[PDB]
Point group: D2
Amino acid sequence: ARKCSLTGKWTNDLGSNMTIGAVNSRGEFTGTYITAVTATSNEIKESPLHGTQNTINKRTQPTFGFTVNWKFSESTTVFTGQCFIDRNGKEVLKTMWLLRSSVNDIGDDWKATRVGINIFTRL
Amino acid sequence: KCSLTGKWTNDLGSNMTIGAVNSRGEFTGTYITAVTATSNEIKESPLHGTQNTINKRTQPTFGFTVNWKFSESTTVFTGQCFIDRNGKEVLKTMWLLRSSVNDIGDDWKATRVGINIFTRL
Amino acid sequence: ARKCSLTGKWTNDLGSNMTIGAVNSRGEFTGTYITAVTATSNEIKESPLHGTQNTINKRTQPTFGFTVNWKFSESTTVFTGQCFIDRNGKEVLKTMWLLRSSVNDIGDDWKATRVGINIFTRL
Amino acid sequence: KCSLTGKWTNDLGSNMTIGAVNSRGEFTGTYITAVTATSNEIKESPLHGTQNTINKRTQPTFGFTVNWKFSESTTVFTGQCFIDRNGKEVLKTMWLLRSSVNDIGDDWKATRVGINIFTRL
Ligand SMILES: C[C@@H](OC(=O)N1C(=O)N[C@@H]2[C@@H](CCCCC(=O)O)SC[C@@H]21)c1cc2c(cc1[N+](=O)[O-])OCO2
Ligand SMILES: C[C@@H](OC(=O)N1C(=O)N[C@@H]2[C@@H](CCCCC(=O)O)SC[C@@H]21)c1cc2c(cc1[N+](=O)[O-])OCO2
Ligand SMILES: C[C@@H](OC(=O)N1C(=O)N[C@@H]2[C@@H](CCCCC(=O)O)SC[C@@H]21)c1cc2c(cc1[N+](=O)[O-])OCO2
Ligand SMILES: C[C@@H](OC(=O)N1C(=O)N[C@@H]2[C@@H](CCCCC(=O)O)SC[C@@H]21)c1cc2c(cc1[N+](=O)[O-])OCO2
Ligand SMILES: *[C@@H]1O[C@H](CO)[C@@H](O)[C@H](O)[C@H]1NC(C)=O
Ligand SMILES: *[C@@H]1O[C@H](CO)[C@@H](O)[C@H](O)[C@H]1NC(C)=O
Ligand SMILES: *[C@@H]1O[C@H](CO)[C@@H](O)[C@H](O)[C@H]1NC(C)=O
Ligand SMILES: *[C@@H]1O[C@H](CO)[C@@H](O)[C@H](O)[C@H]1NC(C)=O
């Protein structure tokens, strides 16, 4: 089997793109995310992400997580999922995400977390 | 003025340390979990994340990833740092726990979800 | 060990309340929910809920699911959890929920779902 | 005009039928899943839920619970029925799969999360 590697430029059906740089010996990587959609009402900007891939037993399809530090919103998104060789032999990232909104009041914390999936292929 | 830096615990008795948050909002930390979904022995594990600095909010949101050192799994946490008028701090978060599955046909069952509330330890 | 039963009036820390009726032999139940808070700009009203308790292997601490059909918004929330006898011998419902907002456009689907917990105790 | 009533399938080839939706928005249905997290043999299982009828929207939200007949688990699904200019419908949902745990101490790991997209026939 190929190893599924995170390093590279990725896209989803929507056409958001993200670029992940080299993954270091501690499993750390950095990258940038450019979303095609927003919950905000200002200009979208390219935002950094930082995360780690899990290296336990050196799996060829490893899990990973990362945090996107949005540069245009007070929110944060975290993604986690796994790098798979898909049925067609291509790498695919199968992820899920939580988008945390900023709320003014701790009484509103209950409504601040949205959840979804995101599936990425190489661009 | 709600800062992520410090030692934190939850009601379960898991603890977390977080270091200085740099001017880009990056921090690293450790997480020692009281419980695992695994049969392995727990080991303190590193975390890395960022705090959101847009508009220098006093109660910022943030995310981090815990890179478990006794499992093939990864957990992410996101939430917000609340600070009351005593200056008591609370991090209210939700997490996704991603297990490693051997086949892509099992991906659907690989992601668990929950909350974790942390106070200063 | 008591059987943990869904039937009864329940509250959470926030003071939202819920009443669940008799659970039938097919494990169905009906009730009502009054939420203390809301994410819409709308006026809050008591709303019905309908769900089932799982009765496989007649467990004393069953899982269950229910849908709240909000009467004051176009939203729906589903809750699922388990009815435990807690360490102190009280019943407790430990649940998680998904709150589905109505969006006007399919392209907004990605952001229509919030997630949370709710812990109920008998009122 | 987006109606829930019908037989539905997803990319995995799970199927679901939903019957008539009454004037209170209630419906019942069945779910035959292609996959399971369990080691039991899958059996068709009943589902019950409601469609939201406030402002009688063309693309209403709805929820339902699947009462699995081969597991101690329960799944809830919630989402929205979308209908294109052509009359082609799709149900975009997310779900929580609650496992049964023996002790309240394991509750934190009992809830899995996912999506499911259904189409007609
Ligand atoms: C599930 C969804 O996820 C994404 O691809 N998403 C993106 O690429 N961007 C949004 C991001 C929001 C950045 C926000 C900052 C803020 O608003 O605070 S986080 C997940 C979502 C998606 C949305 C779509 C879509 C296809 C997909 N998808 O392919 O997964 O088509 C129209 O909208
Ligand atoms: C919801 C729960 O969350 C946690 O605190 N959790 C932990 O501190 N540990 C587990 C972690 C699992 C490490 C695993 C690596 C692997 O297994 O693959 S991730 C979230 C959960 C929790 C449980 C409790 C509690 C308070 C909280 N809480 O505040 O988060 O009191 C009684 O039990
Ligand atoms: C986690 C949270 O959950 C609830 O209690 N929730 C409620 O009782 N109400 C909201 C409901 C919203 C109905 C919305 C219709 C619409 O807006 O579209 S859905 C579950 C959530 C909660 C919020 C709190 C709190 C304690 C808890 N809790 O104990 O879980 O203290 C002050 O705010
Ligand atoms: C995300 C996933 O979800 C499903 O379709 N699912 C199913 O139809 N079956 C599993 C169910 C198992 C219930 C369990 C009883 C028990 O084990 O306790 S609940 C949701 C999931 C899915 C998987 C796929 C797919 C498309 C989708 N989808 O559209 O959601 O194509 C390849 O595999
Ligand atoms: C993603 O990359 C493609 C090709 O580089 C480009 O045409 C598209 O606009 C990019 N998406 C965004 C949101 O920038
Ligand atoms: C958390 O720290 C406390 C006291 O400092 C300690 O007794 C407890 O063992 C720690 N929890 C874990 C899982 O290490
Ligand atoms: C919960 O019920 C108690 C009545 O016992 C009531 O005082 C409280 O306000 C109720 N909550 C709501 C939202 O009605
Ligand atoms: C779904 O329906 C199709 C035929 O209509 C059938 O071939 C398929 O096996 C069904 N799926 C399951 C899981 O029963």
